Amino acid sequence: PDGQYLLKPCLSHRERDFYLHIKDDKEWTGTGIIPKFYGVELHEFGFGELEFIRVENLMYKYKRPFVLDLKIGTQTWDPETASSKMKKRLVVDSTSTTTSLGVRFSGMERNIGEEKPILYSRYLCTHEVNTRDSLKEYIKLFFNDGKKYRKELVPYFISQLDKMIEVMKKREYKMFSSSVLFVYDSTTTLEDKKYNCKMIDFAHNWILSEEECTVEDGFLFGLNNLKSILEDIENEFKSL
Ligand SMILES: Nc1ncnc2c1ncn2[C@@H]1O[C@H](COP(=O)(O)OP(=O)(O)OP(=O)(O)O)[C@@H](O)[C@H]1O
Ligand SMILES: [Mg+2]
Ligand SMILES: [Mg+2]
């Protein structure tokens, strides 16, 4: 997981089409809110070729990665979701913070030099991270590198969410089961700039200029609540 690139297969048209749709939009590609997109590529697979997207690896050259995946939206199903998955989708949405906050914990990795990374399962979302207060604490734990709280990194993450909110108010796209990914290298300085905050996983993105999506995603609602939590974390790290 330590190369320049992520070569992600195109298992459906939606992620590929979204990247192609915004590829000349400076609001998407010049703001640093999504991974850098290199293009769609065909690579040999089976009897023919398989379509891939090539994007930057956000953790390139990270020494001790810290990773936090936050799933955004008031629901994680869309009009194309298979019926066999629907009961589980409805339960997890309602018993996590998804329906209430539009954002929920979806996994964490912390490397504190303890000879093995500490993995926090995404299934913690319906039991241990099922409240706003518990979600705030786990994000605080993400900013804990094992020795201190990296309070200086928080303003970057709020700034990233601000740019995300600005583009999503235009409501040109609906996104389901997408995430905002928090990463940083604990060995970094503010000048090394080895930290990042990006939207990812657009496999269920709808292009509203080309198709209808009746249900709402609650994506802007989730982004605002996540920004509010980080602002609370900023105010609470002042006592350090
Ligand atoms: N550009 C990136 N650079 C580095 N890591 C990434 C990047 N995009 C995603 N990741 C990480 O790598 C793994 C990425 O998955 P993706 O977002 O690719 O999942 P999926 O394959 O679409 O599966 P699912 O829908 O079940 O989450 C995730 O766990 C995410 O943390
Ligand atoms: Mg995902
Ligand atoms: Mg996906």
Numbering used by the authors: 31 to 270
What does the paper say about this structure?
Inositol hexakisphosphate kinases (IP6Ks) are emerging as relevant pharmacological targets because a multitude of disease-related phenotypes has been associated with their function. Genetic knockouts of the three mammalian inositol hexakisphosphate kinase (IP6K) isozymes – enzymes involved in PP-InsP biosynthesis – have revealed their involvement in distinct biological processes, including insulin signaling, apoptosis, cancer metastasis, and lifespan regulation in mice. Here, we implemented the analog-sensitive approach for IP6Ks to identify isozyme-selective inhibitors. While the exact structures of mammalian IP6Ks have remained elusive to date, those of other members of the InsP kinase family, for example Homo sapiens IPMK and Entamoeba histolytica IP6KA, have successfully been deciphered.
However, the evolutionarily related ortholog IP6KA from Entamoeba histolytica (Eh) was sensitized to inhibition by FMP-201300 when its methionine gatekeeper was mutated to valine. The approach therefore appears transferable not only between the mammalian isozymes, but also to other IP6K orthologs. However, to date the mammalian IP6K isozymes have been recalcitrant in crystallization efforts. This limitation may, in part, be circumvented by focusing on EhIP6KA, which has been crystallized and structurally analyzed. An alignment of the AlphaFold structure model of IP6K1 and the crystal structure of EhIP6KA suggests significant structural conservation, especially within the active site. The fact that FMP-201300 recapitulates its gatekeeper mutant selectivity and allosteric binding mode against EhIP6KAM85V prompted us to attempt co-crystallization of this related kinase and the inhibitor. While the valine gatekeeper mutant of EhIP6KA was readily crystallized using the published conditions for the WT counterpart, soaking or co-crystallization with FMP-201300 remained unsuccessful. Remarkably, the structures of the WT and mutant EhIP6KA are virtually identical except for the additional space generated by the reduced gatekeeper size. This result illustrates a potential limitation of crystallography, as it can only provide a snapshot of a momentary protein conformation and may not be suited to unveil subtle dynamic changes that occur upon inhibitor binding. The fact that the inhibitor exhibits the same behavior against IP6K2 and EhIP6KA diminishes the likelihood of a distant allosteric site, since IP6K1 and IP6K2 only share 47% sequence identity, most of which lies within the catalytic region. After an InsP6-competitive mode of action had been ruled out, attempts to gain structural insights by crystallographic analysis of the ortholog EhIP6KA were undertaken.
